[PDB]
Ligand binder design. Structure first.
Ligand SMILES: Nc1ncnc2c1ncn2[C@@H]1O[C@H](CSCC[C@H](N)C(=O)O)[C@@H](O)[C@H]1O
Ligand SMILES: Nc1ncnc2c1ncn2[C@@H]1O[C@H](CSCC[C@H](N)C(=O)O)[C@@H](O)[C@H]1O
Lengths: 337, 337
């Protein structure tokens, strides 16, 4: 249920250990600080909204950059820990913690810039992007958003070790005589379940088999409802022959400031973040020769558990080998070791 | 929030991978098979109820031991998978899968024996023993329960590294300029948070500083309401001199049949199971010399998140030095590697 999902979600962010986990991602936290500070003219004497402030860390960055007032909105119990920090850092004159959902609070005034870290796995997990876009009801016409745009990248990979490892787990249910019991009527249900799990992990970029396809969301322009159904068509130009075990996903965000654009990338070519990368495995790999085209569509449909039902249909155009897959982005396999 | 937690509980058990996890625990599954088959006379031509059948595994063991009729009750969507297995194993005559909660379904008849694996971390986690006890509304007055009794053991331990580890982690917050922010005001809260988590992990039995104290539930005699509040007084006479950092918890169940008694043990002296062992730290270590008496109470108080608040108060009688902790069993720290 939606209210069940929502309770668990904010409980997760009420834990200091989880705020600490995001904060200690130096690539993420340092890149946000650089975006904000190297774009200080965007903050200096301005009014700011921090959507989902957590510990308050990005609001402190806005304050360092010279913001006149910052409304730091937070819906989990972390709001009271943030207020302790604002007090102990002598920033009560500038940072104003507002406990509650950004959809439900009411701010004293319109803001010049909204800052947030609303990104989940594959960019869209957690559906916090919708809360981020919802918050534009508080943005002046002249306003900016940090991050400004989000790019989802998508590329086909070959990874037999990963495929076999997931296949093997599923094939527990291929046993005709587990303690004397035939389990094998469930084998297909087991493969279905195991391959519904996106794989959160990093990998060697040499496993990638074609140039990534890019899907862009402009946060300045997008509307909340735009994220209910996200359709990403793709046509890859195969650069290596081999078996395509699935699609790898990562994302970049850009902070498009008046002084400079700063990028935060979770690309596997880049230093690792707590988002790693995400792979959706095909239940059976597609064979492709270099020079082939692999085309289809990834479709994300917003569900009531603050995430997305993902469907990926991909086909090797030359042979018509087709793979069709459903993935539950809510429930990944965290493989990283 | 009670309704909420139950939703997530049954969804967890709808995953074949979570069923697989328990089935793959050889100690657990193999011991249940041996208990049932070695007590074949408690099953041959008998009526059985399996409370929470999951995959159906235990019901298949009751069929192997010759049961005439087995009602396999299951609340999660795993009931549909259980039925597929009953059909493919050609046991539709003998095993009847009934989808629903054991508190809400109706059975066509009274049973000779109830089987279940309702045990959680330190026996009581998940509160499934209450459903097991509830199920006795279906038991004939002569009837038996497999398992028949459950023993929880508590013993004081010394583990300096485990204790110090809590601070090491919390001291993330003890810095004056994390990206320009003074985080130190939240160090006490981060300490409290880590200490509230029971630690799931195994350990060398040599850390144990006294003979265990045992608390026994007899499933034949006990009522559902008996499990709402579990008061475990203790008086440990210290086998060794050192610092007591907390209490370690494990459990055993006995299958008391007509032919023999079979034990399933999760003790640290036994082969490891998926339950590991559980440790609850004291907020402050207690010094005790060998021959000293460490006395107090462990109070387990059921909550509406299908778990228990754990309240431990202890003192060294000879010194009056006291300590306590309050832990949330729903959110343990899984430390095992
Ligand atoms: N609709 C909403 N209203 C207010 N807070 C929200 C929200 N949706 C998510 N959040 C909060 O947003 C935070 C996202 S994690 C980011 C935390 C912090 N800004 C940092 O960058 O380190 C969580 O604390 C979560 O509770
Ligand atoms: N009150 C209740 N009524 C029916 N099923 C329940 C229940 N409480 C827990 N369960 C189910 O009981 C199972 C416990 S796990 C045990 C699974 C299986 N008997 C085995 O031994 O491997 C889970 O499948 C869970 O969904």
């Amino acid at each position: 249920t939606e209210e069940s999902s929502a309770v668990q979600y904010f409980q997760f962010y009420g834990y200091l250990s989880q705020q600490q986990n995001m904060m200690q991602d130096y690539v993420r936290t340092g890149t946000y600080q650089r975006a904000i500070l190297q774009n200080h003219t965007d903050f200096k004497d301005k009014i700011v909204l921090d959507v989902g402030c957590g510990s308050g860390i990005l609001s402190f960055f806005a304050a360092q950059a010279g913001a006149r007032k910052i409304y730091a909105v937070e819906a989990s119990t972390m709001a009271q820990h943030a207020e302790v920090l604002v007090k102990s850092n002598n920033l009560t004159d500038r940072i104003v913690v507002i406990p509650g959902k950004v959809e439900e609070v009411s701010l004293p005034e319109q803001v010049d810039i909204i800052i947030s870290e609303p990104m989940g796995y594959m960019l869209f997990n957690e559906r916090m992007l919708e809360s981020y876009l919802h918050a534009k009801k508080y943005l002046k016409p002249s306003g900016n958003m940090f991050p400004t745009i989000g790019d989802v990248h998508l590329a086909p990979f070959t990874d037999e070790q990963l495929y076999m490892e997931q296949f093997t787990k599923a094939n527990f249910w291929y046993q005709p005589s587990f303690h004397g019991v035939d389990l094998s009527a469930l084998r297909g249900a087991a493969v279905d379940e195991y391959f519904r799990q996106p794989v959160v992990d990093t990998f060697d970029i040499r496993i990638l088999m074609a140039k990534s396809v890019k899907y862009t969301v402009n946060f300045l322009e997008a509307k909340e409802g735009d994220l209910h159904r996200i359709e990403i068509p793709f046509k890859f130009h195969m650069l290596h022959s081999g078996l395509v075990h699935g699609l790898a996903f990562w994302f970049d965000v850009a902070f498009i400031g008046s002084i400079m654009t700063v990028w935060l990338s979770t690309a596997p070519t880049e230093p690792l973040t707590h988002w790693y990368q995400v792979r959706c495995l095909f239940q059976s790999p597609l064979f492709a020769k270099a020079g082939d085209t692999l085309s289809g569509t990834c479709l994300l449909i917003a569900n009531k558990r603050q995430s997305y039902d993902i469907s990926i249909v991909a086909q090797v155009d030359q042979t018509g080998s087709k793979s069709s897959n459903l993935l539950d982005l809510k429930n990944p396999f965290f493989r990283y070791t």
